[PDB]
Amino acid sequence: VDAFLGTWKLVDSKNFDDYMKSLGVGFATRQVASMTKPTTIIEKNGDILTLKTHSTFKNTEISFKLGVEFDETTADDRKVKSIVTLDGGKLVHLQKWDGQETTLVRELIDGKLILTLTHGTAVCTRTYEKEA
């Protein structure tokens, strides 16, 4: 997990508004979150991986041990069971709640954190460059 550890600012968000409508997010939060560029910062302690998404809405902190499902409240106010494991340098995250489940697949392509947000026929592929 070493290549993840660093500060990362949003460079591109392809298909963001299509993913936000598939989940159920109203027009003012859907438009302000596309204008916002949030800073994802992955850190370490002793197996406790602290991923801090610093947005102009609510700052979400997730603390995770690689193969452990944890109950978490999101920035859109939702109880979600959150299972992230490492697949050869790839944090394959799955947040699941009452029929609806979104995958947050984070993959290093040429020093860039590619956050692939897939739900109901709308994949938002988000390029982040390293600011560390």
**Residue 78 annotated as lining a ligand binding site:** no
Residue 8: its H or E element = strand 6-14
CA neighbor of 106 nearest in space, from 79, 87, 130: 87
**Residue 7 annotated as lining a ligand binding site:** no
CATH number of the domain enclosing 105: 2.40.128.20
* Under 8 Å between Cβ of 50 and 43: yes
- For 55, the domain range is 1-132
Antiparallel, parallel or unpaired: β 68-73 and 60-64: unpaired
Method: NMR
Distance of alpha carbon 70 from alpha carbon 105, whole angstroms: 17
Distance of alpha carbon 10 from alpha carbon 89, whole angstroms: 20
Backbone angles phi, psi at 3, to 5 degrees: -55, -25
Alpha helices (H) along the chain? 16-23, 27-35
**Residue 74 annotated as lining a ligand binding site:** no
- Count of domains for the chain: 1
DSSP labels, 89-125? SEEEEEEEETTEEEEEEEEESSSEEEEEEESSS-EEE
